[PDB]
């Protein structure tokens, strides 16, 4: 009965349906919230966000593990800093990751290489990922230069964190 | 039964706008190579052509609404005057109006909608054609 009445239910002022609730004189006087009020109500967190956080933590911790392994095994000059060449190369990171982790996919291996390369500068560096959504390539006029766009996004996020 | 009819008639899949449209389209495509004669008819003999530029009443549209080549306007006006003189065009009114309009609604609509921009008879024709075929 209730599930059928849900679709039969009126929503416009018509015949035997009318807004005597002061909506015409006062307007919308009843609040209605779409968020669960923390202590009382509960709704399960979305799995897209769950997976996002889990993946970010996985990548960060793997990058730290590799950095500590490199330090176990083994200062940056101005020229090297400008060249952005770290203690390890992308090819080296890719080969070691592929050797130690067979099932890990090509895309995930590239992601691990990027994160390990970037953790030498900044561990989390989560500001650039977010700023990418606020600022777009076309807006900054840098559309067919993805490398420059990402370089600027990293620069700007790491400056914003200050 | 009749035997010349089977060899005369040919089966068509879909009807044409008019039977030679495919030939005309191919001819035009080759003429362009890819892989106005209205000033001649805008005269007192062509009531439909002169009416194509008049309002529902038989008078002139605004210049903004129906802009034209000045020679076309002069010829339109003189032709309308001469035809009305002779009595080949009503002194007040404009037949051919609906015939001239182009944005026409459908039979079951009230306004023109810009979005608009095997029948049993031919089935029986096919059936009888094949019945005679054997």
């Amino acid at each position: 009965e209730e599930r059928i009445r849900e679709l039969m239910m009126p929503l416009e002022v018509g015949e035997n349906s009318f807004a005597a609730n002061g909506q015409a004189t006062h307007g919308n006087l009843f609040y209605f919230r779409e968020y669960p009020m923390y202590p009382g109500e509960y709704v399960p967190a979305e799995h897209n966000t769950l997976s996002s956080l889990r993946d970010e933590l996985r990548l960060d911790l793997t990058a730290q593990s590799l950095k500590e392994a490199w330090m176990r095994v083994s200062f940056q000059s101005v020229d090297e800093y400008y060249a952005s060449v770290d203690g390890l190369d992308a090819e080296q990171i890719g080969e070691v990751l592929a050797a130690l982790f067979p099932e890990l996919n090509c895309y995930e291996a590239q992601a691990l290489v990027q994160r390990t390369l970037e953790c030498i500068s900044r561990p989390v560096s989560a500001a650039s990922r977010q700023l990418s959504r606020t600022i777009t390539a076309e807006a900054v006029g840098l559309d067919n230069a993805p490398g420059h766009y990402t370089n600027f996004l990293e620069w700007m996020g790491r400056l914003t964190e200050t | 039964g009749r035997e010349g009819w089977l060899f005369g008639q040919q089966v068509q899949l879909h009807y044409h706008r008019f039977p030679d449209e495919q030939l005309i389209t191919n001819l035009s495509r080759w003429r362009t190579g890819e892989t106005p004669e209205v000033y001649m008819k805008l005269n007192y003999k062509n009531p439909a052509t002169i009416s194509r530029f008049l309002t529902r009443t038989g008078h002139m549209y605004p210049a903004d609404i129906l802009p034209l080549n000045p020679e076309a306007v002069v010829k339109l006006r003189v032709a309308k005057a001469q035809a009305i003189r002779i009595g080949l065009y009503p002194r007040f009114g404009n037949p051919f109006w609906f015939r001239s309009q182009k944005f026409r609604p459908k039979a079951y609509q009230e306004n023109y909608d810009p979005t608009t921009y095997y029948n049993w008879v031919q089935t029986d024709r096919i059936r009888r054609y094949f019945r005679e075929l054997e």
Binding site: - | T55, R56, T57, H59, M60, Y61, P62, I65
Partner: protein, 103 residues
């Protein structure tokens, strides 16, 4: 609007201008521009009067339809005429306190 201005609630000059405007509007309403005439269904339209303000800054043409269902076919076309109406006022009536805004 809330009320409807009474015939006795307007100055004699505005009243005079109003009946002139009503006369000319009723006489010439079929001779509107063709691109609006071709869509206006004159069979339904009716105009009760024109009221206007004191000194006729504004004119209020009171209108309706024979069948109420035609108001929403007629209203936009009628509002596309508010310039033609002003030109008609300019052309035909000579004693006008001043050329008004049509509503």
């Amino acid at each position: 609007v809330r009320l409807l201005r009474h015939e006795s609630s307007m100055s004699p000059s505005a009243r005079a201008f109003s009946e002139r405007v009503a006369y000319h509007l009723r006489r010439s309403l079929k001779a509107c521009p063709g691109h609006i005439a071709e869509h206006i269904d004159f069979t339904q339209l009716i105009i009760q009067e024109v009221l206007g303000s004191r000194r006729s800054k504004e004119i209020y043409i009171v209108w309706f339809t024979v069948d109420p269902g035609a108001r929403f076919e007629l209203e936009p076309r009628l509002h596309q005429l508010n310039h033609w109406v002003q030109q008609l006022i300019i052309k035909r009536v000579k004693r006008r306190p001043h050329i008004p805004r049509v509503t």
